[PDB]
């Protein structure tokens with residue numbers, strides 16, 4: 063009779079408190095740390111009263127009613143601001159969801175010895191700081207995976223803080239934020255899929271992906287798994303985080319009890335601890351594909367029953383087409399497989415209302431150009447990457463995309479282009495047959511970042527079109543954009559280049575980011591400059607910066623010499 067009691071008992075007090083803190087920090091990203099912990103503790107102690115008697119006052123209230131009521135107990139609007147706390151459920155929860163900010167304007171690592179002192183001072187307060195700061199900067203983070211990150215975070219300190227601490231803690235902390243931002247972007251795509259294109263689009267994506275990983279499983283087994291996984295991500299993406307974690311744990315138990323009807327690669331994943339086992343299953347490699355599978359053309363092109371099966375049970379028949387095609391093509395990206403199933407459905411739509419056997423007899427010819435376009439694209443960029451290396455590969459992609467959509471803001475163009483260029487590092491080391499799913503599905507994740515970053519403040523009609531027209535065609539849409547000829551050159555400002563004392567002591571990574579910022583501004587100012595012309599200007603300006611960083615009075619040099627180039 064009490065839902066808060068049910069989840070407190072299923073998850074245990076430690077994971078309960080952590081998940082409630084994550085939930086509050088994702089809904090109110092600007093609220094100070096001390097105010098959230100205070101609300102968390104009141105919630106936890108009420109939950110204990112309900113475990114002791116599920117008929118006590120208020121113990122019958124929904125989780126949304128209880129969490130929303132707490133958040134409503136604690137500046138300038140410029141005339142525009144939604145008032146979520148004046149709404150009733152379920153409208154109030156929808157209002158909270160609509161104010162999640164993907165780009166929180168919030169500040170961006172103290173000394174190694176300084177952290178170690180705060181750790182042993184209070185471990186528990188130190189770990190909650192880690193959850194709070196990540197959750198408020200990534201408001202769609204997959205909440206059960208964040209628990210697994212917090213445990214690896216706790217283990218790095220419980221080892222390195224106790225000969226040298228810097229050479230022990232800093233490499234580990236560095237892979238925790240790489241692997242942290244990869245995980246965040248990956249889940250932002252699932253949530254955008256469910257919220258903008260609907261449940262039916264998500265389930266197709268999951269049929270395709272689970273059929274590749276589990277090609278020996280029966281179609282009925284894949285469909286059960288997809289139904290359970292869709293419920294989990296629906297919950298995590300609508301802020302039902304206690305339910306999401308409880309159902310994720312239940313799904314892992316089901317998979318591990320039924321290994322022999324699912325995959326032979328699960329042996330070791332299923333012997334690991336609670337959070338580690340779900341994380342293991344999520345990244346398991348594909349199983350071996352059965353030999354001598356019958357031809358696809360036999361059931362889907364040649365059978366005289368094609369139009370009958372499409373009419374009598376359309377969702378099952380089209381789901382079977384996708385399952386059968388995907389299990390025998392681990393070498394295709396998920397979005398390519400979804401494009402083929404859409405083409406097949408359109409064709410039967412047309413042909414079954416006409417000699418249909420003759421109408422759709424040549425449907426496989428339509429698939430060949432869909433397969434060839436991404437194969438050639440990724441063959442070319444890998445050639446370029448191997449020649450140029452990551453930094454200059456990034457700069458090649460940055461000039462291309464700035465010229466496609468020059469209205470997009472400079473920070474967003476730099477961040478997206480850097481991430482697009484990481485695809486060569488990540489995927490070009492694989493042999494041919496392994497490259498398409500690695501590269502084209504990573505590119506979907508980065509292009510979705512461009513879409514959600516731009517949606518907050520739309521300025522480019524072309525970005526809006528490609529992001530709203532069709533989820534699976536996003537990458538071909540962007541690849542096809544030419545240079546905008548209607549863009550008026552941006553005029554010089556100069557505030558971009560004002561001296562700051564930190565520019566003469568940059569790390570290598572932050573040097574690249576400064577140079578990439580200046581290249582975007584240059585293309586926006588001179589959209590017709592050739593490649594040789596851009597290089598000559600770039601190389602002269604970098605030499606100016608190196609000159610004045612060696613001066614007796616740095617600021618004087620920057621001010622005196624910078625003005626000459628401005629009036630040149």
Ligand SMILES: N[C@@H](Cc1cc(I)c(Oc2cc(I)c(O)c(I)c2)c(I)c1)C(=O)O
Nearest residue numbers: 268271275291310313314340343344345346
């Ligand atoms: N490269 C893709 C492939 C992939 C997607 C899903 I969707 C999936 O099914 C699960 C099951 C559980 I349990 C999870 O916690 C999650 I997250 C996904 C599995 I196996 C693999 C990816 O991993 O996204």
Ligand SMILES: N[C@@H](Cc1cc(I)c(Oc2cc(I)c(O)c(I)c2)c(I)c1)C(=O)O
Nearest residue numbers: 439440442443446458459462505540541542
């Ligand atoms: N030297 C090549 C020209 C070429 C330039 C770029 I820059 C490039 O990289 C991308 C990456 C993405 I993602 C795109 O959507 C696009 I369009 C281009 C590729 I591949 C090829 C030739 O002449 O064959």
Ligand SMILES: N[C@@H](Cc1cc(I)c(Oc2cc(I)c(O)c(I)c2)c(I)c1)C(=O)O
Nearest residue numbers: 558559560561562576577579580603604607
């Ligand atoms: N105004 C900013 C600091 C800032 C100063 C300069 I001078 C600059 O311009 C370049 C151009 C090239 I080409 C380089 O290789 C480098 I390093 C810096 C940039 I971008 C940023 C602030 O207040 O923080």
Ligand SMILES: N[C@@H](Cc1cc(I)c(Oc2cc(I)c(O)c(I)c2)c(I)c1)C(=O)O
Nearest residue numbers: 554580581583584587600603627628629630
């Ligand atoms: N005297 C010109 C103004 C002008 C100043 C600069 I300094 C400049 O050089 C750069 C180099 C980089 I690198 C940039 O990102 C940018 I924006 C401009 C250029 I070309 C033109 C006029 O009044 O028309």
